[PDB]
Amino acid sequence: SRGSSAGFDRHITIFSPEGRLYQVEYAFKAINQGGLTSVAVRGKDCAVIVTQKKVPDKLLDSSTVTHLFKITENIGCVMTGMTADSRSQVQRARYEAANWKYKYGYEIPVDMLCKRIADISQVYTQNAEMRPLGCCMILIGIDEEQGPQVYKCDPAGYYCGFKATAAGVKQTESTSFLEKKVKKKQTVETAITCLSTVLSIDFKPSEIEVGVVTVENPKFRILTEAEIDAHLVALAER
Amino acid sequence: SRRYDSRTTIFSPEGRLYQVEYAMEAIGHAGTCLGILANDGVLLAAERRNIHKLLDEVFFSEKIYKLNEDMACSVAGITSDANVLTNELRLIAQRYLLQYQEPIPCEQLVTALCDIKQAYTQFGGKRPFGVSLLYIGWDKHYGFQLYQSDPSGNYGGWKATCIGNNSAAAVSMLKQDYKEGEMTLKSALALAIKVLNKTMDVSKLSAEKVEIATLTRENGKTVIRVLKQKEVEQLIKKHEEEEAKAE
């Protein structure tokens, strides 16, 4: 015990002598290979997702570089990690949500969608023939009774609802920032401030992406550059 | 895929089935379990391992399973594996009864299960079941019977036998004290307590720590009873009384 290994416990999802799944732990490291960080926060009126938009090239069509995804018209999502894995998990989420609506006659609750994706991830932690997906999904939406929601699930199949949360390279630093801020008794401002602190950047409007849902306007919306700029300008004048 | 495959159902270089042998080591460590054939009945006597703690005592026994009206069994080895096999025994017994409208002869039930166990050692690449079983019963072909099966899918009929902890030592004791053609349920019960008193190295043997079931005939009908704790204490006492005359 303490970093012990037997057999194939570093290669497939079997228990190590301590009771660990090294392959799952390695899927968490795969999340940081993308090099990006994402933050999400929930208020009484709205929920917001902000993530980095790195476009080093500019031979890229930057409209197609995004980690923000519409799942349904009322459910939005930010993906952190391996891109192709992420895209696949987005398809599955879309499929699960459409199917729920078809069978049950009402939009999937965000908590249920997250749970479902987590339960699917769980299968890859217990069956030896496939790897976990090296990605993390954060979902936002409005619930009719509970208000705005942010949910996250991970490659271990854990999931939770959050007041605010983060994913990727600066997760632990964003968590600390949000902890000290939430400890006291504006949601888009907090999210972009958190991200800008932990990266020490101070953004241009083309270097982030922002997604929102609000109690008034529950349709998932992606902000334009101009709309983001207006928030960046409003913060700059303290 | 080839890389990860244990290869559970292949021969070793000396013609051996390693997974079977290792299962048999698991059984060697499990709670001791014996059966004794008498003229007027059959018994099973087993060490309890669910013994005790803050445990609740909810079922009629821990390791004695009724299989049908005329048959019971006991198990030594992996408990969950035993639950799969005993459940399957019950099913085999009811399939026979459906088809013939008479009870499955004891040996046929054992054989049917042993074919399943054998198959797990020859195809499929799975681990075998880590279980040995003692079976007691009555049928109209051979009357009172006792059988033993093990993880290879091998079996045999016995007048007395033991599986589990200190088996070799128990079979010694039985070879000497067991009277072929001349045992009663009362003398076999005394012999059972004698052997369990030797083989449980957990020194001063107790009723809380053993289970006995008897199988007899009464009015053309098979009776299967798990002795209550008052009967088990009373028999331990008669074995403690009996040790002296020996002095």
Add this chain to the structure above:
Amino acid sequence: NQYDNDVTVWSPQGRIHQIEYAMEAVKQGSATVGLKSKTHAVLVALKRAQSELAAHQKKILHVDNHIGISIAGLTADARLLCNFMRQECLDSRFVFDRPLPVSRLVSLIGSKTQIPTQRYGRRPYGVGLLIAGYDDMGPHIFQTCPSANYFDCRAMSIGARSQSARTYLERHMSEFMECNLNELVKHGLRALRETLPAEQDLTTKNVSIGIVGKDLEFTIYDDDDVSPFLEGLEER
């Protein structure tokens, strides 16, 4: 070693050793030559005899009236592939009442042979083909490989010591398009003869010829029927 047994394991150099090893099967087969003119496609092949009393191995197989093949590598894989090709040609005549175009047949071989290069426990086909055909686009010589790749050729040679044939074919290929048929076969035979040890010669026992074109359904020539092509005899 940990990268050379499975067709599903990429090496660190971006190679698949099982495919390369399948390609060695074809380098070890006896040589064959494929070439074409404006009007004909011809195959020429060296046949090996396991002993003096054995018959020489077939290297040239009929596929349809307008297609034949020459093989190098595992014979059993050659037969399985040739049977596949035959079937696709029959299907096409069944459905459309016209010959399957040669480039479409070659595509079908590519798809079919690529499949096992990507699945665990499967293996490449260990055979390389030269394919002679004639259709509306005229004569063709294609080459197929164990990698599932294929090539459209002015001429080609595969198998043992085929590099010598290739070198002859390059030297004279600017002549091929306007050769009459005898000239073209003479060219094939000379290219094939270059693969032979200095002592060894082309005989009626060891040469097999395949011809298709504008005037002629795919026809195979063995034994006494190759004699007209061998005399002939330019060399020295």
Add this chain to the structure above:
Amino acid sequence: SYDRAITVFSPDGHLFQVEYAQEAVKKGSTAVGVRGRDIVVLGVEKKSVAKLQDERTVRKICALDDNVCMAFAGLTADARIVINRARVECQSHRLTVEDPVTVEYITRYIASLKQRYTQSNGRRPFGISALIVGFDFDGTPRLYQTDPSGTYHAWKANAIGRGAKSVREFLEKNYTDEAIETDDLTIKLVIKALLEVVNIELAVMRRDQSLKILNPEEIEKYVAEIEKEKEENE
């Protein structure tokens, strides 16, 4: 379903899983068969003795049909499977041809079963050999043997199991017209052959008369009658 090749060739042409199955046979109880003139006999070593065992439940000699039976050496569980499959097949033959099987027919069936398990994905070979005996419709007595490879042959007499080497050496020198002229001697030839390595279960099949098993009082008659003769021979 388990598609692993289990029996494969090794570099010098060996099928090692089959050779290992053969090692399982060599650690089994010795079994002997002799083809007499108008009788056929099979006998087999101890098992364990063990005073507490029900003798009936561990016989290593088994009826396949009225006119064919077998003994085996090797893995007993594997043998039970082969035995039941052959029994099923005897009844199919009876069904579709309205004759009992020849001893050869069923020997051939058992052998091809065994051969299949050496050339099929997910299965190890059967760890047994079998001696198969009986009589055809025309009265000719028969002794056949099968092994894990699916090879089969006819024998005048033979052994399999532990110490088959020496027991076969004994039979080679001792099988003569004189030792099989009568039934008593044929039966004795088997018991002497076993006493060479060996208790002893034994059974006989007379032309038409179906399978008789002996009988521990009738057996130790022959035991003492050979044991005292191998003391005079010292």
Add this chain to the structure above:
Amino acid sequence: RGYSFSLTTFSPSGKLVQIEYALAAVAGGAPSVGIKAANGVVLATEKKQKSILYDERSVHKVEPITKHIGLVYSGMGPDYRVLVHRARKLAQQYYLVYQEPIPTAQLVQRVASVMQEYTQSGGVRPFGVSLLICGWNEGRPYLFQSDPSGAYFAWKATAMGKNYVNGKTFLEKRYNEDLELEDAIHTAILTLKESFEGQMTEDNIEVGICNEAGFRRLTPTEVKDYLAAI
């Protein structure tokens, strides 16, 4: 089409080490406690609650299976969720055939049997969880545990997860068979306090109860009240 071969096999000493290693995941899991009272059953567990950022009410560890049966675990949460879904599905299948709620013992047998499958079936690992299952049927309370091997046991009281050996000796010198449910809740919470670290609130433990009225979770405000006196 899967890996068909087992991933749990016997070692030379007769151990199934993938199960032993599953048990190690259980032993490093958060603590759980079950106590069978005379007139009820209590299940309690520690919520490993890092960060004030979690919404504590969003996911639960103590779960209803039916109106009369509930669950808690120690070990890996996502594995537990699988088993909660199967137990629920098993409970309904039973109800559809028999039109009677599934007896606690029957539910445990069926769930244990699913756990057994994952010790033998191709290409999978066992579950890294032990379950505690409470229920009320035949006018009487039940408490069961089911382990990664698929073995189950009926308990009067027990503990699992981190520090369980001590939890069990604590309960041993504290449980009696004639104890009421409100008192058993108190001692369950005390058993967790033995191995807590951090100071308890009603937002980082979870408690479920089972009696004649059925199974339910205690609310934050009910737990807060029991936490006065602790």
Add this chain to the structure above:
Amino acid sequence: TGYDLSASTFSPDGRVFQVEYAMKAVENSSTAIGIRCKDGVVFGVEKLVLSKLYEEGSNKRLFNVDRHVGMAVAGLLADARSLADIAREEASNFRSNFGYNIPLKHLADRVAMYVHAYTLYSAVRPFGCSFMLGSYSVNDGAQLYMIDPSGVSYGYWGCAIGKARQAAKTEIEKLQMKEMTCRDIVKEVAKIIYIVHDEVKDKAFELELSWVGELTNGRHEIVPKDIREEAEKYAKESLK
């Protein structure tokens, strides 16, 4: 590595080396480029001639996958051809189910998910190819997507794949492609291919050119012979 034998195994640093090794097969391939402009997309490929016995045209690396979509490939050619068949089937089925030409973005995403599925399992290996998809229509404009062996898919103004990738990208970055036309860009695609071609290390190549734009009425087509030759001549003379 430990660790690099199966796409179902993560390394301890969170990498999937079988996918990286497939990427290496592409990075050993000769270079293909795509450029999106004002009124279409143009593709060019450096096609190495491994033998003068091959026909001028053989081993095409530019494919029509629908009447409005071209595909440009680098890497293991049999894997690339099989991917062109998947793309073709996807576009064909799209038209059958929904009744119109598949939007390029949607075809790229669908084919990328297929490529992605070969990166999770021991049962299969990753594709050893990267490919670009190009189209033009009046409604959607010019679009150029690129997909690699991990199954990642992005839209581009300009793109290069294969061994002189980086060298090609720096030349492409010098173009104001947004304001230029296909008839102009062909010359520049040919020019860039001749620049990044290592004429010492691997002599002799054929240039392969195709386009899709207003000037082809939204059909993907080979660049005509006379225009290819003028672009070759421009490229060659710009080098000297």
Add this chain to the structure above:
Amino acid sequence: SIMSYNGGAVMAMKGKNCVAIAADRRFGIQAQMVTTDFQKIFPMGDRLYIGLAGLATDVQTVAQRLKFRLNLYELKEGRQIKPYTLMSMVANLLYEKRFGPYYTEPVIAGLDPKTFKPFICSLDLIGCPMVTDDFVVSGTCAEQMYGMCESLWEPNMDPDHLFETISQAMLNAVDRDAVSGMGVIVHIIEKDKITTRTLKARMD
């Protein structure tokens, strides 16, 4: 009609801490009597019986298939099946064959194995259950049986009066049905004993 091919009749009836179940004894094929001791009531428990009328082959098959299921249930559970639970088990077995049914319409009579409360029910051939507090009938003379039961049945009958009523209901019913009768068997089920009688009955 498929249900009149073999004929037959069963009924059950509730009393004070007791139940009764009865059946005719004829096995016949259309007009022909084959046997006069054919069993239609099967014990499912010490105090719990199922009577089946309908096509004789399915009477037997349903009884045997049900017993299979009950035997497993009792082995696996702690215990003897409750009446209401046997009803559900039968319902379930019949509705599995919803689109190719067994041609049998059972009645169940018993006492709870703990509380000894009386229980009766019947089911149709696809497993619709009907529980009543008085009586249930099934067979080719259902109308005849309803006439008798509806006129004779009273509440809270002791074992003796229950016997006379169920017997008179059956005997007079089947005597107006050509393909039921050739004898009647009656089981009275009490807490402490089972009483089984055959009745003196018309044999035409």
Add this chain to the structure above:
Amino acid sequence: DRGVNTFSPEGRLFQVEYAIEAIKLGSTAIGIQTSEGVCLAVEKRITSPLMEPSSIEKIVEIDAHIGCAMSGLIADAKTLIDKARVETQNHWFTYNETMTVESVTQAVSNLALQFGEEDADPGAMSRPFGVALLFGGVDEKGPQLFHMDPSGTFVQCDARAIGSASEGAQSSLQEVYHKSMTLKEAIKSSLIILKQVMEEKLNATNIELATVQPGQNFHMFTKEELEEVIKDI
């Protein structure tokens, strides 16, 4: 450890090369093709006098006009022989004619390489067949002998030996073989050569011989007919 369909660096399938090594452990068999018929002769290789020599069959009738001699792992040969039998009867059923020797050989040889472990239908073949075969028969091409090995390569042969002593036996066959050779000369030649290469002293019970002739159906020689030919020694 590696799968049954792995290529070696030299471009051969390991399992097939290894199956070819198993043929070298088999008894020697000889075939000779003459204008008067073909003959097949095989060393039985008796391992004990207790064994019935006639229960060793290594030459088998395929159809009336075709025999088969085998060497290697004999049990493996059964499924191949059955398949040859069934194919010739299927051909007769459909076309009302006899199947050519070359066609029968071809059909059997198409089973060689049909083994594997993930494509895989039943529990279909897990490995190649450890057998070589000589098919000798008569069709309208005249008398004909073909050889097949575990690779699925098959070829016509004027004379051929297989099994342990085949190098030596083949060398002796090159020496004696001529095209105008009679069948009775070919029979004597093959017995002469088996005598040399066998570890046991040749006699009428430890070899088998069969012919197929234009006039005549497949014929296994009797003890008595063997004794006649053995006299010349």
